[PDB]
């Protein structure tokens, strides 16, 4: 399949080189997979989700996304125009309030929720979780991310936006999950992207167009935006039968564009997520 004039990040993920604008992907499109977006929520009613998004949990007085952040992320995962996995099922878990904030304790609870909740969902091709959030190092937060992963969910997390070593952030520093740095359309490490040995992969994160609340769209930037590209990619690859929740991060690293990014600090992987799709 070919989507012309796609957001640059979608095009980049199906390309061996920067500077193209068409997104190429197998039409299976992540059908039969599920992605949990653990964030400010999802405006499920957005036309771009086509009935494939649902709120499953909130820790606040509402499950609506009163921010837009969770909605943007979900859109990059699986909206029809702005999504990597255009046919995946999207499940929203509101651990972050409408200011985008959340106590670590609620975030942990949300991770443990998904690990159980996938047993109440129909996801024959596999389960992915996209965590575009983080804070300072916490062993409890990392442990929760490690449980979610061990349970059979492909866990993708943001490296963080401090232009700093991600070892000092959680869940970014957890070894057993997929930690995702950000790049721009010229293949530079995004100026705010964290780095370090704990990163597993980079995805598009600068100037990323996706869905927003009020049924609109906008371009914003962050390792928050890179993460859902990798999450959507994993879901897509799982439906293709190429990989599984336990091996998807490795598989993506293995099949990545390699050595192509600039301003990657010494000791950080130079790998850009790539679907290796041959149209």
Tell me the catalytic residues.
39, 69, 224
User: DSSP assignment of 118-162, as one string?
Assistant: GGGS--TTEEEEEE---EE--HHHHHHHHHHHHTTEEEEEE--SS
Work out how close the CB of 218 gets to Ca ion at its nearest, in angstroms, rounded to a whole number. 29
d(CA 61, CA 72): 21
Instruction: Report the residue number, 7 or 171, with the smaller CB distance to Ca ion.
Output: 171
Q: Going by C-beta distance under 8 Å and a sequence separation of 6 or more, which residues neighbour residue 174?
A: 141, 142, 143, 145, 146, 157, 198
Closest alpha carbon to 171 in 207, 134, 129 = 134
Work out how close the CB of 117 gets to Ca ion at its nearest, in angstroms, rounded to a whole number. 23
Residues that bind Ca ion (rule: CB under 5 A) add up to a total of: 2
Q: Is 18 annotated as a binding residue?
A: no
Work out how close the CB of 146 gets to Ca ion at its nearest, in angstroms, rounded to a whole number. 10
Of all residues in this chain, which one has the CB nearest to Ca ion in the complex?
A: 179
Query: What count of other Cβ atoms lies within 10 Å of the Cβ of residue 239?
Result: 22
Q: Is 20 annotated as a binding residue?
A: no
142 lines the binding site for Ca ion (CB under 5 A): no
Per CB under 5 A, which of residues 179..198 are in contact with Ca ion?
A: 179
Binding-site residues, in ranges, read: 16, 175, 177, 200, 260
Binding-site residues for Ca(2+), in ranges, read: 16, 175, 177, 200, 260
Rule CB under 5 A: which residues touch Ca ion? 179, 200
């Amino acid at each position: 399949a070919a989507q012309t004039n796609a957001p640059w990040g979608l095009a980049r993920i199906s390309s061996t080189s920067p500077g193209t604008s068409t997104y190429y992907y197998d039409e299976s499109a992540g059908q039969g997979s599920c992605v949990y977006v653990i964030d400010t929520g999802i405006e499920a009613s957005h036309p771009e989700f086509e009935g494939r998004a649902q709120m499953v949990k909130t820790y606040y007085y509402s499950s609506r996304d009163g921010n837009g952040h969770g909605t943007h992320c979900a859109g990059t995962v699986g909206s029809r125009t702005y999504g990597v996995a255009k046919k995946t099922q999207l499940f929203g878990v509101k651990v972050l309030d409408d200011n985008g904030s959340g106590q670590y304790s609620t975030i942990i609870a949300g991770m443990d929720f998904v690990a159980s909740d996938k047993n109440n969902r129909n996801c024959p091709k596999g389960v992915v979780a996209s965590l575009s959030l983080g804070g300072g190092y916490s062993s409890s937060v990392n442990s929760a991310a490690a449980r979610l992963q061990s349970s059979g969910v492909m866990v993708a997390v943001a490296a963080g936006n401090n232009n700093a070593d991600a070892r000092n952030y959680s869940p970014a520093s957890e070894p057993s999950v997929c930690t995702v740095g950000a790049s721009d359309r010229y293949d530079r490490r995004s100026s705010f992207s964290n780095y370090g040995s704990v990163l597993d992969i980079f995805g598009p994160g600068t100037s990323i167009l996706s869905t927003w609340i009020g049924g609109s769209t906008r371009s914003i930037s962050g390792t928050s935006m890179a993460t859902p590209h990798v999450a959507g990619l994993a879901a897509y690859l799982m439906t293709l039968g190429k990989t599984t929740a336990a091996s998807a991060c490795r598989y993506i690293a293995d099949t990545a564009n390699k050595g192509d990014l600039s301003n990657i600090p010494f000791g950080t992987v130079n790998l850009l997520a790539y679907n290796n799709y041959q149209a």
